[PDB]
Amino acid sequence: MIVVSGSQSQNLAFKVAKLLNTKLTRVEYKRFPDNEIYVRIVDEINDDEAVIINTQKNQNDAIVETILLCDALRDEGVKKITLVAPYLAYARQDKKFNPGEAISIRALAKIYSNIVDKLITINPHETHIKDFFTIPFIYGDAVPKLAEYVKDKLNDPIVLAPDKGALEFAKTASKILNAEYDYLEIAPKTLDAKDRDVFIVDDIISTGGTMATAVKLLKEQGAKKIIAACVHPVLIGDALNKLYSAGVEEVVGTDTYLSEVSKVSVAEVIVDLL
Amino acid sequence: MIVVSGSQSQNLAFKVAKLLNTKLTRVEYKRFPDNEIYVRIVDEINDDEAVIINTQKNQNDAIVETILLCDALRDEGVKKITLVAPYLAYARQDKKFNPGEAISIRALAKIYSNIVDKLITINPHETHIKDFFTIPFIYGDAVPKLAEYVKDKLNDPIVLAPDKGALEFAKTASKILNAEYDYLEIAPKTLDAKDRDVFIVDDIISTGGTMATAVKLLKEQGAKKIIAACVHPVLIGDALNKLYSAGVEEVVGTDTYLSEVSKVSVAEVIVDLL
Amino acid sequence: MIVVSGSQSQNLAFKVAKLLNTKLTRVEYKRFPDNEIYVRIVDEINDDEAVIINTQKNQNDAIVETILLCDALRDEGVKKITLVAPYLAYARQDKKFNPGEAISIRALAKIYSNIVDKLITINPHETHIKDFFTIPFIYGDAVPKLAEYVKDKLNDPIVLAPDKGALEFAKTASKILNAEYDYLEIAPKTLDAKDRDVFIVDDIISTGGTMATAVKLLKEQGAKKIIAACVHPVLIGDALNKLYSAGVEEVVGTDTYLSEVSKVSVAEVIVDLL
Amino acid sequence: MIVVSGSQSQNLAFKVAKLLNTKLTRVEYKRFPDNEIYVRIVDEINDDEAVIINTQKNQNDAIVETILLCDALRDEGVKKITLVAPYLAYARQDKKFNPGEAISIRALAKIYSNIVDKLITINPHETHIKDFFTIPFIYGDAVPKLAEYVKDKLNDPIVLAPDKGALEFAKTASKILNAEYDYLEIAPKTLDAKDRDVFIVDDIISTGGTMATAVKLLKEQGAKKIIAACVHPVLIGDALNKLYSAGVEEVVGTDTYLSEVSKVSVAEVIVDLL
């Protein structure tokens, strides 16, 4: 297998290819004057199985660039193309939340199904979206790498899921830290934050309103050191400043989405799925 | 048939639907906080044949937005979807100009072929790109509307094609103005600009280097009033200022690509192809 | 005086320089790889009084590009620089609408005051913002050019201001069309739309919610042909589609802000203010 | 003193305020529908001396946002405002490299001089640009934090400055690693890479052409483990992929400019300058 760097995951692709003990296939990427995307496989591709690693922070650009990379790889032989999209755009469009809406991830699933043979992503908004794929849909989990990152800096804490739906993440981290978990329902459904360190984990932190709320509250409940983590740190606008004011000790996310707090890497999570 | 407005051609769609004596189907379009595209068909769709009019100035956004609109229309019935993309992005990637390059328009042609039943565009960079489509590929011509726009403001001129490859456009306009045509090869292959009004037409004006050159020269040859026209006025950066300095009297383009000189509309050119 | 083209008003600058019977001073503009702005005065500047015409659709880019152009012009002699900013960004920040907010136009007024000797803009959100300038603050009005555009296509109509604060524009247009004016307060404070053509004018159409409302209502009141006009057609997202569905016959704006309906030019309005 | 977070340095501001044992002043930042910037100081400001930390990756946005934050802080009391701009945009425009060009950093220096009382930046392209400021112009150095980062992972290496002008950085790092330094002039002016680990440091890595070259060469000269570092990792386009192919073992930059390799923080470098 050869590893192809997408434009948006050049360092993750490198880390992955390093773990796989492979040389990174040089791939040229540029924008024409009008801004159109240009991809070209510089190195020679003997192997006929390629792995494309390109996250989708810039949703549309990533989608079109992937469509073009596939065309260039097929045209170079490669019988099997595996697409690694750490952050998969449009996954929040599970269903028709209103009449006339378009189920985005479904439409794109159809396209991915005709251009790549396998799709691997990290912590999708919803795993049921696999039903839309006529190809293998793999999803790894980074919560554990997050749990490990903070296990070092939290004195016997309690894991908390901002909302009941994030409970699974809380539990997972809970296991790796040997702590107790629970979720907010506003106050924790069971446990009490009084005088304890807290580790709040969720899959995404977008505007930061969900966490800001949990953080502010937990502090008012007498919690001590609090660290907020998430797989995809979208952190829009002043999200970070929002959490920092709320009192968090630190905010930490992975490199599935570039942010000022993408301290944890999913490189290994990806390698084990290949 | 119903006319669906893409986000990038809202006024052209209106003009077209007006000519077709149809009501414009209200279509909701917005961006989520993270910038993902959101489309929703607000009005009810009884008819089962829709026409999508969305040019691609923002190449990637237009492509993904089209992919989502189709998904929403199929999901609403509509057995036949005709996509009108006045300006078709990635059409300059005709072939592999180097080993390892991706034939962009080919890859996207494959996608258009699986999501729409027919594709109509105005003055593609190359018409041979139809070979890539497993569906009807129609291409109209706006040169005539351009010729008509200036016939009014040029005292017995001569039509000129910047390069030999733009000759066809020159001739076409030439016919509608009853003037003589020719092309630059640097000087006009035959005719002479001395003391005459000149109408230079080409399909695209990107950086403006091609025209700036023709204009500067023709002026040095004693040409009088010069008007530069093109179907797609990409006009990147200081392109316009470049031509104005060169001495053009006016620059005029159509509405297939929004610019400060999109004075001519292709609405009717489109209607006749439907 | 010499006319300097900003990057965002290249065609307006040309039209203005044409009316002033002057040659447009060639100005180079480009972006470095990292996207920083680069300006260079290509032609020689003997005259010591320059006029910069650069609207601010891309607010921040326009502000910094203006800051750099001034530096280049002073460095070339030019004792007096007049800045023409058809659309003046940040003008909606009149005052502190909340404790801790920044009065944007005030901060920028201070900057304009130290880099240009005179500022001319078309239809500011609020004219009181002149108090913030330690230099001459001129503001022209395009409503008349708008009134003239439609006088040709509306059978004895009535001018309407969407809100009481847009009354002034309604009246102005009212005068040039000899029709009666009035404003919505929801229904017209006096006149009745029943069986009449309507011309609704306002200074800005952003999301389109204000007009969409007026249009829908007036139609329900039995109005006939309706045309919506505005000086600055910001028309965000699906604004146009919104108005078209509401039933407007046409939407028309000026070239102070590039849109698909910038059919009217303020070139002359500007020339008379110089 | 209070620490104000700019939108582009929210995490660095937090780290700095943490080191300063101060609470981060909550600052609201958002974009209106048309994209204009909106800033509001949410918390109360008793102290009359503020420190603004906002790097300029998005050059123009950062400049205007700073102009607005100052206006809001003065309006809140604050007699002294210190601006920390880790990465200072437009610093490469030292002088007029051509007739008619604008000395960008000079024009902006004038503005910074009238809105802030002190300016602190990390590793400017040129320090002579201080001549343009009528206020205190401080510049810290991150090379040492970079040297420290790699001292841990390089077996007795040699520090190399890509070009003679980056020599100073090489020497600095050289001191902290006790290794020998030198520069490329193509080959190293003195030392030889044969069988040795190499640490190449420069202030900026933009397109990556400078380093890619050094790396490729040094490898051809038999160098072993090579690590490339820089203060500002602009890393445009495929820059990283370019270096990785060239053979670098790792690329590392600071958080003055967000990138996928901003592993080293300048928080402390900044704190010591306050």
Ligand SMILES: Nc1ncnc2c1ncn2[C@@H]1O[C@H](COP(=O)(O)O)[C@@H](O)[C@H]1O
């Ligand atoms: N990229 C996005 N950002 C924010 N909201 C989204 C996005 N994509 C879809 N949505 C909406 O988010 C809501 C998600 O509901 P849920 O999955 O239950 O959290 C629906 O109203 C979706 O239309």
Ligand SMILES: Nc1ncnc2c1ncn2[C@@H]1O[C@H](COP(=O)(O)O)[C@@H](O)[C@H]1O
């Ligand atoms: N969007 C674009 N802008 C500029 N050049 C392009 C674009 N798409 C492709 N090209 C290149 O333009 C050249 C076109 O050659 P031709 O079609 O003969 O004019 C080839 O080197 C293409 O790779």
Ligand SMILES: Nc1ncnc2c1ncn2[C@@H]1O[C@H](COP(=O)(O)O)[C@@H](O)[C@H]1O
């Ligand atoms: N560019 C903008 N777009 C939308 N709203 C804005 C903009 N600039 C300021 N505002 C806000 O618009 C409101 C305008 O009130 P008014 O001037 O009475 O219409 C205040 O809450 C301002 O903060």
Ligand SMILES: Nc1ncnc2c1ncn2[C@@H]1O[C@H](COP(=O)(O)O)[C@@H](O)[C@H]1O
């Ligand atoms: N942001 C930038 N990116 C790339 N080049 C720039 C930038 N700003 C200025 N320049 C140009 O870079 C060259 C720098 O020369 P030097 O400072 O000797 O490396 C001059 O021709 C400048 O006009």
Ligand SMILES: O=C[C@H](O)[C@H](O)[C@H](O)COP(=O)(O)O
């Ligand atoms: O179930 C979990 C929710 O989807 C996330 O908590 C939510 O998407 C995060 O959004 P925000 O940070 O803007 O509150």
Ligand SMILES: O=C[C@H](O)[C@H](O)[C@H](O)COP(=O)(O)O
């Ligand atoms: O054959 C015609 C050429 O393709 C066009 O003249 C060319 O694409 C226009 O480009 P520019 O205005 O940047 O010179």
Ligand SMILES: O=C[C@H](O)[C@H](O)[C@H](O)COP(=O)(O)O
């Ligand atoms: O007084 C007039 C109002 O300021 C305008 O009607 C308003 O700003 C237009 O905004 P929108 O088109 O988003 O409703």
Ligand SMILES: O=C[C@H](O)[C@H](O)[C@H](O)COP(=O)(O)O
């Ligand atoms: O003196 C040092 C040079 O300014 C830098 O080496 C240069 O600016 C880096 O540019 P690039 O990575 O695009 O070669």
